[PDB]
Each structure stands twice: as C-alpha cells, then as structure tokens.
C-alpha cells in the first residue's frame, strides 16, 4: 500500500515502484503492454512534485539534478545551468499518486539534507 503504484509516460503505461533497499533509494517504472521499463534513481532526482487539491490531475513530476558550475557564457555576457532532463509522470489515479509521492517526495528533502 505504498511505493508501488501506476503511472504513465510518453503515452506508455506501466507500474511505478520505489526502492528503499539500496543506497540511493530509487524507483523504476515498467510498462505492461509497452514492453518497457524506466528506472528513475531518486538520487539523480532533486525535484519531486505531485498534484494535490489545486491539481486534481493526479500526476507526479520528478527532476534530475542541476550543476551550473559547468554553465557557459554567451555573446550577451550571460550564462545559466545546462538544461537538465526533467520528467513529468501522469496517471489516472489521484489516490495512488498522493500515496507514492508522499513517500518518494520526503526522500528528496531528506536526501537533499545530506546528499
């Protein structure tokens, strides 16, 4: 009744499960008919947002990391962190999402406090 849930990506449905057995508590996604599996390491993930009250669209969004240290200037003497790789997960379950986001989200704030 937690961690494991259903989610969809790129029009491909699958099951989303979190793993708190390994060092970097990560989660992997596996499709049922799409014959695909996406392992998203919460470690590499720094951001996590679910859709509550205001957002009844039931969807979980997790972003990787950001390192501006490797940025690059420009003709306008301006720079910025290299556009990372964000991920927006969306399922047709508002109850599930809020159940898996609450467990996967906390880990971010918990990890970020040490990582």
């Amino acid at each position: 009744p937690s961690h494991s849930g259903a989610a969809i990506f790129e029009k491909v449905s699958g099951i989303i499960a979190i793993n708190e057995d390994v060092s970097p508590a990560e989660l992997t996604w596996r499709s049922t008919d799409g014959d695909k599996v996406h392992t998203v390491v919460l470690s590499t993930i720094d951001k996590l947002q679910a859709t509550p009250a205001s957002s009844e669209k039931m969807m979980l969004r997790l972003i990787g990391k950001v390192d501006e240290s490797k940025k690059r200037k420009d003709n306008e003497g301006n720079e910025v962190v290299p556009k990372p790789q964000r991920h927006m997960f969306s399922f047709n379950n508002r109850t599930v999402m809020d159940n898996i986001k609450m467990t996967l989200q906390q880990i971010i704030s918990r990890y970020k406090d040490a990582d």
Partner: peptide, 27 residues
C-alpha cells in the same frame, strides 16, 4: 492539437505545490 490532454488540463497544475524543502542549497 485540440481535443487532447495530459499537456493542457490534465498536466499543468503541479507547478505550484512543491519546491520548498532543502534543494538548491540554502541553510
């Protein structure tokens, strides 16, 4: 596009609920 979703109604409301824990440094 027009009669689609997951990118106009069912995918545009999670940009205002999180982003406030211990990321991007701070304390």
């Amino acid at each position: 596009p027009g009669e689609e979703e997951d990118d106009e109604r069912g995918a545009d409301a999670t940009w205002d609920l999180d982003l406030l824990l211990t990321n991007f440094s701070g304390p």
